């Protein structure tokens, strides 16, 4: 029968297992025989200490590169401040070696782990693209605990080379099954940022992962948005436990924190899931996450039930990842049908926003055509608008099934007069709904100011299929 790891700090890894039900249910996956064997994960970050006592056994040079210095060796640059400890901490969450008398264990403690040194220098579009596109037929899963600064006032995302890397990855990566891109949703909670204003997390090609504290609350750093898919545990207040992992200079830390710690745990769980079914496509993986993730005991004021009976929150997506449930569902999973894309231009004329604008449109979702969608995956409202103070806007999208997605909440620090230029606000909250019928877009001025602007384009973009639905929850 299964024997849990004996590592010295494993008992402190509260988020991996416990009696309490406040965990990611990882031991249950281990007991089913899945520990990440055969799977390759790469940490895109500031480097990886490849000789660390708890990483060396799992290290994979084929999953590693130094894009900052342009050589194969991803070793972190040592400094007095230990600036470049971040990637090593993330790597240990995924794949720290088990049963070796050192530190704790990775979620997928038998997976192969690499790192791309790419944050320690000027991070250009080209740098991102070379990192995201690294050895895509060897690396299965990419983990990114980085992005635009979450200052609550900018709109930023992948430029051309990085976006091309995402499409090449999901199309041709992993033998055509698609690279798995795991993203940390952000740490701009205190700045009141929205993760839909971040093109990396807002992307359909990335699994954006948010955080919950040990006591099941929304952490101070957490950002709410409709593009988030799911949640893993991370740090909270000083009474709540934190993340245990490998640290720079061959040390062990019990104080890894923030949005940074959530993505790697997700990547580890996804590694166990790929071991259970190597044939899963990038879209299969997101389906599994949607079906198996658990809201229960996560506290939020915005939990809503969507059109197919699933609970969803802007703080948490579909809730906590559940590794046991993921690997169970993966084994006999039937591959989803090819992805369809239904493009619907909503406006006939520009519309003044004023104090409040509501745009109602009944759609057929490409009825009678090859891209007919009856089973929604991602939906985007690609919006082009002008406005005098961007952060005063709040934008909601309501699906025909009555699911209200917040595309954009007020951002008090966003004083931009540049509006949005075909920004593709994305929601995961209507996953598996029938998108036929009335969609409603709401744009409102949340301030008392006399603001002004015009919506000039609203493209509703639907992704999904026309087959294979389950009886709702
Ligand atoms: Ca260990
Ligand atoms: Cl597309
Ligand atoms: Na190097
Ligand atoms: Na940009
Ligand atoms: Na493909
Ligand atoms: Na995403
Ligand atoms: Na309908
Ligand atoms: Na209606």
Swiss-Prot record:
Give the highest taxon in the source lineage.
Eukaryota
Annotated region (Disordered) at 54-75
Which free-text remark accompanies the cofactor?
A: Binds 3 calcium ions per subunit.
Annotated residues that bind Ca(2+) 3 are located at 150, 193, 223
| One GO-annotated biological process of the protein | dibasic protein processing
* Topology class, membrane: Single-pass type I membrane protein
Residues annotated for Ca(2+) 1 binding in this entry: 7, 54, 97, 100, 102, 104
This one is known as Furin
**Activity across pH:** Optimum pH is 6.0.
Cystine bridges: which residues? 103-252, 195-225, 342-366
Q: Its family?
A: Belongs to the peptidase S8 family. Furin subfamily.
Task: Cite the record's note on assembly.
Answer: Interacts with FLNA. Binds to PACS1 which mediates TGN localization and connection to clathrin adapters. Interacts with LAMP1, LAMP2 and LAMP3.
How is the protein modified post-translationally, according to the record? The inhibition peptide, which plays the role of an intramolecular chaperone, is autocatalytically removed in the endoplasmic reticulum (ER) and remains non-covalently bound to furin as a potent autoinhibitor. Following transport to the trans Golgi, a second cleavage within the inhibition propeptide results in propeptide dissociation and furin activation.
Organism source for this protein? Homo sapiens
* Catalytic site: 45 (charge relay system), 86 (charge relay system), 260 (charge relay system)
């Amino acid at each position: 029968v299964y024997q849990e790891p004996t590592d010295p700090k494993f008992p402190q890894q509260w988020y991996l297992s416990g009696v309490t039900q406040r965990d990611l249910n990882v031991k249950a996956a281990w007991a089913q025989g899945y520990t990440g064997h055969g799977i390759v994960v790469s940490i895109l970050d500031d480097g990886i200490e490849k000789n660390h006592p708890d990483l060396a056994g799992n290290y994979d040079p084929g999953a590693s590169f130094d894009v900052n210095d342009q050589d194969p060796d991803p070793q972190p640059r040592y400094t007095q401040m230990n600036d470049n400890r971040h990637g090593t901490r993330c790597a240990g969450e995924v794949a720290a070696v088990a049963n070796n008398g050192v530190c704790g264990v990775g979620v997928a403690y038998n997976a192969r782990i690499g790192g791309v040194r790419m944050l320690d220098g000027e991070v250009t579009d080209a740098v991102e693209a070379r990192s995201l596109g690294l050895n895509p037929n060897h690396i299965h899963i990419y983990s990114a605990s980085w992005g635009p600064e979450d200052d609550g006032k900018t709109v930023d995302g992948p430029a051309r080379l990085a976006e091309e890397a995402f499409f090449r990855g999901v199309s041709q990566g992993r033998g055509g099954l698609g690279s798995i891109f795991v993203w940390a949703s952000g740490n701009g909670g205190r700045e009141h940022d929205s993760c839909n204003c971040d093109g990396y997390t807002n992307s359909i090609y990335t699994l954006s992962i948010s955080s919950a504290t040990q006591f099941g609350n929304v952490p101070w750093y957490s950002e709410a948005c409709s593009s988030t898919l799911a949640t893993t545990y991370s740090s909270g207040n000083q009474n709540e436990k934190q993340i245990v992992t490998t640290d720079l200079r061959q040390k062990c830390t019990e104080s890894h924190t923030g949005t940074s710690a959530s993505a790697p745990l997700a990547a580890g769980i996804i590694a166990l899931t790929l071991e259970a079914n190597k044939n899963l496509t990038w879209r299969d993986m997101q389906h599994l996450v949607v079906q198996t993730s658990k809201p229960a005991h996560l506290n939020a004021n915005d939990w809503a039930t969507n059109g197919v009976g699933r609970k969803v929150s802007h703080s948490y997506g579909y809730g906590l990842l559940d590794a046991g449930a993921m690997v169970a569902l993966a084994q006999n999973w039937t591959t989803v049908a090819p992805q369809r894309k239904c493009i619907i231009d909503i406006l006939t004329e520009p519309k003044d926003i004023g104090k409040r604008l509501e745009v109602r449109k009944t759609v057929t979702a490409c009825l009678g055509e090859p891209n007919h969608i009856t089973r929604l995956e991602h939906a985007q409202a690609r919006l082009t608008l002008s406005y005098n103070r961007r952060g005063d806007l709040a934008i909601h999208l309501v699906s025909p099934m009555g699911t209200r997605s917040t595309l954009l909440a007020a951002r008090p620090h966003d004083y931009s007069a540049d509006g949005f230029n075909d920004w593709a606000f994305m929601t995961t909250h209507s996953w598996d709904e029938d998108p036929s019928g009335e969609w409603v877009l709401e744009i409102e001025n949340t301030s008392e100011a006399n603001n002004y602007g015009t919506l000039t384009k609203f493209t509703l973009v639907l992704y999904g299929t026309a087959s294979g639905s389950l009886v709702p929850r």
